[PDB]
Symmetry: D2
Subunit: 247 residues, 4 copies
């Protein structure tokens, strides 16, 4: 049941899945001209189905960029598979993490772009940009988000992640306050501090963002883009609550 | 080269630093062994061979991991399958990535709560697993051995050496400190987290601090590190310089 | 489609586990389980790809700590991924494998062989706590260099591995061979390409045909019962295969 | 370290160095054919030896000019390394027996846009220069689907496990210069693994039509000089496999 979150001729932003059946994980795909961009593609456990859902929309040889927000252990199993099935892809991972690439069968880094802490920009043959923005400590030590200025969509990874209730999945947040309880425990335990959340929001508030797309949970649209950014900005998380940790 | 080293010993309780970037530690107590962050699948044939060489692998009874991935999560199923009597200690935050590593039976998995726990040994001695979250991992722990008075600190106090110039002990803190500063400023989450950790840790007796990478703190360098780390501006404190 | 009982006398069951369909699909693999007293025996359990659900299907029938023997006919690449997984979830199991390959087990994460039983070329006997036995009989070159079948004298069932294996068509799977000649198109090409020689087929047929066999249970395909048991053994003994066709292979 | 087995300026056959100054496993040979500016790997090592085999190859040729990788049959480990080689040699096609391509998913191989499945009759790799490599049938010697590779320019037969030997503890050597002291390292494996004398004879008779300066096995030492014709005569009369089956069925 794929979905188009944006479409202008050169540029589609796609929300694939799901199935009927592990947490729920989302898969997103950007089509721009004759190249594809994978966002946090599924690791080895889910790999047969994610790859077929992908080959179903775009030639796997036209995948030209694969971006990883961070080193989840269930995405890290898949780097070598994606590398070996998408010969034309560069793989983008944080430079903090590239030393572990041998430990995954990656010994040649000629298609590995280690992202600097300040971030970077992917430029495509069409002439459109993707912005990989710093998002460190939310939650991983080296962590990034991806902003598509053509589509006006922020791929947030685990920022805005939610875990659904028992068989009550849904794809879009149209009522923020009823969505928040699926979010709150994860964000307080995992996000490093309110200082980190305020800095990240103050940065994403300068981009034109119609939709925030997390890696788990529902896609934020409409009025929940504002509401999530406010809630996140004032959130006490992580070290702010570290006396209840350790306790 | 790589003769083993004894950091503590009385006949009944030994704390060992194995030879060969990454350090390997082994606590022997009575007839139990305790592995501390043993190497993952790439180093496994000789790390496993080096341990079996000091202690029978069926008397390994506890394997402790400060935090998860990839230097060591390649190895959890291997250590599980070659140490039939071991319990594996890992943060509860990560135990449901365990299927994705072929670990489907969790009857020998001890998921550590955020407040930590204690390993009690048949001898009646204890090991204290103390919280160290956000230094650097979201779920992170250190191990305190009260008999030997040694803190196994994981990456807290880690150093990356120059060239082929590794050494085992920091006997001069200030000449060692530059090998530490970049890592700790980039990785440790905030000074608030370092200050909270030092204040709990400094209530214990610590003759040595043993990190997972780098040199072991002994002598007066143990106090110098705890005071330096307590005042360290790290991580989110430098976040406008991370960002740009 | 549920699990099925091929034999039961109170203390001894031979189980043919049901299929999930849920295609998959090519072709399906069978899982069998022998329960004797309070101990279980797995026959060629699936490797790592099928392992989560294969393991749950077994755990639903028997406590995995009661599995005490795991037998592999031969060294399919589908199963060697799972040897370490089964070792770790069946703490009391010894696994029986061919000695030709016991030295290459490190390449699959198996370094301690205190629960590895290397089967010599003669075969061996699994003795069960009750005092019943399973007989591991030689089946070398049908097809792999080191290969075995398992004969259950209590249940009168031969677990044949790949001998008698069949590949089903798209949506035409079925559990039992009640019409041998209709089953033959699903079997014949494989056996002619894989089984090494008619000389090997004759030796194996003459050995197994001295045992009392109500059913033949292969690792892929349908279970032979009734008249198909002796029809299959007769077909197999006269089969021209493998090196007997080597001028047609080479060309 | 690496060795040159043939050279005419434009065509080489390499016997790559090993290992490892000290022994590991009980180990294997790696071969490399250079023709024009394109490379051919012969049974490159699986994942455990992959860091070392990969760097040894990069020392002789850019991994981007590897265009053919040939596998005699499957094991693993050699099947452990296919995904690694596929991902490090962009331009290589992998040649494997058609019996074996169904196990490819179970090793992470999902898109066979770069898999060249060999039919039982064999095939010829045609190189850009116009030279060829002959993939010749060798089925049941020992594996069900099995092939050898013959290089007509270099006059070298890469034999896979045919002619394989396991060395004694710390007495490895690179060349068979005396067949008879080499034979004890070989015969138990061949009598147990090779399917029948009938299979050995057709293969020797097939192979005897080629000019063979040298037989290069995957384990053991390379046959040269008088060992070649000594090996082919021994292998031709060998009682193996099913011929010895009533000791296997007492």
């Amino acid at each position: 049941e794929n979905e188009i979150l944006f479409d202008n001729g050169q540029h589609k932003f796609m929300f694939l899945g799901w199935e009927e059946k592990i947490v729920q994980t989302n898969q997103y795909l950007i089509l721009d001209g004759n190249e594809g961009i994978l966002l946090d593609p599924g690791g080895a456990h889910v790999f047969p189905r994610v790859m077929s859902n992908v080959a179903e929309v775009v030639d796997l040889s036209s995948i030209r960029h694969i971006f990883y927000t961070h080193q989840d252990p269930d995405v890290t199993s898949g780097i070598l598979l994606w590398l070996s099935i998408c010969e034309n892809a560069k793989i983008y991972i944080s430079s903090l993490w590239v030393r572990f690439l041998p430990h995954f069968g990656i010994y040649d880094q000629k298609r590995i772009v280690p992202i600097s802490d300040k971030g970077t920009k992917i430029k495509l043959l069409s002439g459109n940009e993707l912005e990989i923005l710093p998002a460190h400590f939310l939650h991983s030590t080296g962590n990034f988000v991806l902003y598509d200025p053509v589509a006006k969509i922020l791929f947030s990874g685990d920022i805005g992640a939610a875990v659904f209730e028992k068989g009550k999945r849904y794809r879009y947040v149209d009522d923020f306050e009823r969505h928040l309880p699926l979010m709150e425990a994860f964000h307080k335990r995992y996000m490093s501090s309110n200082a980190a959340c305020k800095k990240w929001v103050d940065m994403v508030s300068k981009k034109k963002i119609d939709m925030i797309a997390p890696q788990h949970g529902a896609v934020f649209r409409g009025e929940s883009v504002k509401k999530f950014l406010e809630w996140f900005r004032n959130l006490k998380c992580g070290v702010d609550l570290i006396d209840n940790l350790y306790s």
